[PDB]
């Protein structure tokens, strides 16, 4: 493991499962699980990938992807890998995996504060 100083480094733990946005699909979502936590470096994979190591990737927390799960469920827009992916698997494995990370989540879920941000919120603005 590793103990450093105080903050959101030491609430995430390898394992936690976390959402994560698309370059090119910004409307699009995906499940993702930390594979490995290194002084905030978590190295997120695509669910279903986990045999393969090469489709992985790597972040900080202090990213603006990094999204908890559950949000998806109040607007749903679309929740769907990428094209980069899903092909490689069955839909049904892409859904397999999708289904019971979901539950996880509910069990090694991660707490707020993670990402405890704050910035302009108020309403659009024609121009």
């Known amino acids: 493991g590793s103990s450093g100083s ?14 994560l946005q698309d370059s090119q ?6 499940i993702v699980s930390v594979i490995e936590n290194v002084g905030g470096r978590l190295r997120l994979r695509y669910v279903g990938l986990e045999d393969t190591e ?6 900080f927390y202090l990213d603006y992807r990094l999204r908890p799960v559950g ?10 890998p990428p094209s980069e ?3 490689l698997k069955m839909a049904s494995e892409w859904k397999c995996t999708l289904e019971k990370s979901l539950i996880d989540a509910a069990k ?9 941000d704050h910035a302009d919120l108020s309403g659009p603005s024609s121009g």
């Open 71 to 80: 949000w998806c469920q109040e607007n749903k827009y679309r929740m769907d």
């Open 108 to 116: 090694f879920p991660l707490p707020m504060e993670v990402f405890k």
């Open 85 to 87: 992916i899903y092909p």
């Open 54 to 59: 090469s489709y992985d990737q790597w972040l």
């Open 25 to 30: 699909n910004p409307f699009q979502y995906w």
């Open 6 to 19: 105080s903050g959101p480094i030491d609430l995430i733990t390898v394992g936690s499962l976390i959402e």
